[PDB]
Amino acid sequence: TSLFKLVMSATTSTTTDTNPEVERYFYRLNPAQRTSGTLTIPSTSFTNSSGAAVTSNIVTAATDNGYYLLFINGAFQETSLFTVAASQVRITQTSLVPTSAPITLVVNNFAPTSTSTTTVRS
């Protein structure tokens, strides 16, 4: 009395890998790029993960896929304390930080990948 349809089903298996790659940058504070409670550091002065100076730009946080960590004298900081852009990095309330200080900025970017297979039987 009712329409008849073919019945089948399938099975899918999915494997996922995060493939993290982490960018590390370093800077030593000289009282050169220093102003009235503001510290704008040029993007050209950072040393990359190979111990060599970065050439053109710093790798920003992946869109909706990453986060930032900042280290000043071994004390962890807030997101609000600093802004990160492609061509420059600037931090405010830097009046009291001393000369030659170590500044470490951590960029965690994740680029997950996944492949799948599907088996259908009749």
Place this chain on the structure above:
Amino acid sequence: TSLFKLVMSATTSTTTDTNPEVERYFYRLNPAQRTSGTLTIPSTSFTNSSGAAVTSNIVTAATDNGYYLLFINGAFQETSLFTVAASQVRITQTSLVPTSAPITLVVNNFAPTSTSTTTVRS
């Protein structure tokens, strides 16, 4: 001599984004919530990454999706040294830590999402 069945196969493409969100909290140590080698910090005394005090509760580690990092005076600590709860945070072996010391609690939470498309041909 054998049953005859229809043969069809499919193809699946999957995209996965980690979609991390990282919660940061801060505390300056006063010798107020201090006892015989134990430091119980009320959840109300923490300040978020926006520089604002937390109101109701701290975001715990996501169930089977996250991890904790603890910073005291810039020295990394063990998971055993501290326990994190919704309404309070307490740490042992805090006899020697000085006044106004910075303590940073890092909570990483991951909320992956994925969508897929399947094409079946006959």
Place this chain on the structure above:
Amino acid sequence: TSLFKLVMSATTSTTTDTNPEVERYFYRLNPAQRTSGTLTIPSTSFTNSSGAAVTSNIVTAATDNGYYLLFINGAFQETSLFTVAASQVRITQTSLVPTSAPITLVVNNFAPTSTSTTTVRS
């Protein structure tokens, strides 16, 4: 005039969980394994996040699925500054680092899992 085929399509729902496992070890620098600007730490001297000494080996970075963090005196270091193997850890340019200094080695390993279901209609 053309071949006639059966039209069918499917729908797939996929859930993914990162499943992080973060490994932490600890060591106090004694002037024992110290040489001409090189510090080779035996893998037997580290203590895990449980406060217990490690027995056989350090859990290395997951293949294409993890990253390393190294802490010396609260100053974040570079991946070039050190090499990590299963049975040992060694670091160079360690002439000036003082005795009993805290050193922390952080291992982030991610082992994602995912399961899926496919619905096929006729």
Place this chain on the structure above:
Amino acid sequence: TSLFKLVMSATTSTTTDTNPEVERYFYRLNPAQRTSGTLTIPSTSFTNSSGAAVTSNIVTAATDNGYYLLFINGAFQETSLFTVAASQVRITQTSLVPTSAPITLVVNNFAPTSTSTTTVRS
């Protein structure tokens, strides 16, 4: 004492040929002639066994001498599920059938012929 009549007899041989001719029609389902659980297909949209569209009318089942078969997605159907007329074809319970689906309507018409020869001897 009884009426005398002539005695005769005959012999007949008959050959019969079925002369089948089978009409085949095809349609791909678009959600155009679709309504509240009913699918009325115009007779103009079918394609003949030559791969060409039919012009004026579909050949109905020969009176008293034929039968119908209906295919939807390869699943055979009932005579009750559909009605066939000269100017149109309509089917009920078609809510779930997908787009571009193949529908095949099979018309079997038989036009038997027979010729005979009779031999009479005296």
Place this chain on the structure above:
Amino acid sequence: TSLFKLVMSATTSTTTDTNPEVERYFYRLNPAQRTSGTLTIPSTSFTNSSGAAVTSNIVTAATDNGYYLLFINGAFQETSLFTVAASQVRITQTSLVPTSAPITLVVNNFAPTSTSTTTVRS
């Protein structure tokens, strides 16, 4: 010199109609009457082309006047794969066929009729 006979002749016209009637039955496969690679279907569970369940028996093939067609998942089968009787239907090699699958059993029965007239000339 020879015996003299009466010369007469006849003419016969014959009309033949096949009078087809086609029986259709339907069944949805439940894993109830399922065994070690054998599927014996009770004759009580079939539904006719009227959408009504059959009551007493299945109309078998007409003696020397008909044939069978069997449909499983839209794949046509051999006469060897199944046997059809009045009170039951059983099929072998049914280990892999899924649940709720459609099974269509087609019975073609032909009951030809013919009437004739004869005209005799004297």
Place this chain on the structure above:
Amino acid sequence: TSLFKLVMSATTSTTTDTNPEVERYFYRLNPAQRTSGTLTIPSTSFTNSSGAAVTSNIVTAATDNGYYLLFINGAFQETSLFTVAASQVRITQTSLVPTSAPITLVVNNFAPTSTSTTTVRS
């Protein structure tokens, strides 16, 4: 005044039986006899309704007494789509049909028989 002739009449009874003969053959599509949009299948590869491979030739359609049905993946097909010969079977526009697919070719052959009796009255 007119010639007088003997008056006689006859009666004929005829019985007809269709005697259907349905031949079934089967084939699994391997990408062996496959070309630029053409699929010529050797007549030696077919298996009959008895589950046995055919030996010499395929029983063609009875001259002026039969018809063909072709099944590919459960979708009924066009007469123009394929040509059937004694020793060869070929189909065009088979670029997209998948491997190991079920192909079913149906041959309906009818060989009617009829016998009659005639009674003549004097």
Place this chain on the structure above:
Amino acid sequence: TSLFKLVMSATTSTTTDTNPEVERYFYRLNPAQRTSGTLTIPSTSFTNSSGAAVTSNIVTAATDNGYYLLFINGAFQETSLFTVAASQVRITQTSLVPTSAPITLVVNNFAPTSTSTTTVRS
């Protein structure tokens, strides 16, 4: 199992100069400020180390940093024999001391200074 703290140490170098200044005063005894075995000398009658009369006051012993020496006729005396005030000096047992005799009061004051430097390494 224990709290981890940063190890640091320092080194301090200190240079100290006594920076002495010595006040000398002179007086010649006349039988004017003379009484019954008591000699109260006005502070205005003394002559400084420059050979000039003092104007307003004599510099007393520095608080907890100095001492006194008194000379009468070249014979050293006791601290008990005399008292020294800002506006006057008086000595007892002065019945027998002759006219025009020399009296010398020696006031030693020390005002040490010290400056230091501290070097801290990490």
Place this chain on the structure above:
Amino acid sequence: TSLFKLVMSATTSTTTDTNPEVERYFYRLNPAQRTSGTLTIPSTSFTNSSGAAVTSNIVTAATDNGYYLLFINGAFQETSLFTVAASQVRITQTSLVPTSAPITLVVNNFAPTSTSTTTVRS
């Protein structure tokens, strides 16, 4: 490419006070403890700064922190001319010194004190 350390510096303020203390002892020479050009004075016969006789012992020169002055008849003397011990004082070359002459022995002892404060900033 090089080890990264924490930069810190300090400041120290030091205050020093000499805090002198001077001991004075007198003696009148009687021709009693007199010999062949040698004068050995018992330590019991001296009178203190208060005009009171000493009881047990004279305070010797502070170790590496003091000096001696000796007065005989108002003429200053050499260090070689006399030796000062805990329980006695003896002087050579005293044949000619007259009776009842005054002898003054001056002991300067310095006990400096210093306290300091250190300020360290990060």
Place this chain on the structure above:
Amino acid sequence: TSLFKLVMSATTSTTTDTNPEVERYFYRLNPAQRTSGTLTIPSTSFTNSSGAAVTSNIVTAATDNGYYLLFINGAFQETSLFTVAASQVRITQTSLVPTSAPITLVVNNFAPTSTSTTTVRS
């Protein structure tokens, strides 16, 4: 909302010793280096506290760390009354001083030393 810094402090202990050195020199006045109210004494004629004549030079007052005392016939003198140099000593206003008189010149030189230790905790 504010920059976070590491809090540490130190503690310093300082010990200071005056380290006095007292130089004494002696002279007997002969009417040889005597002139119109002036007495210039060659530095070659003095005898030290060891009873030995000086060889090359007089130890002058330490720069900003010492003072002088001068004795003539047991009467203490003025700073203005005399001047002291390395190789020469001269005094004015000496017409009346008699022959063979004793002259005593006292040099007080202080060479303080101080060593310190700093303890820094974190």
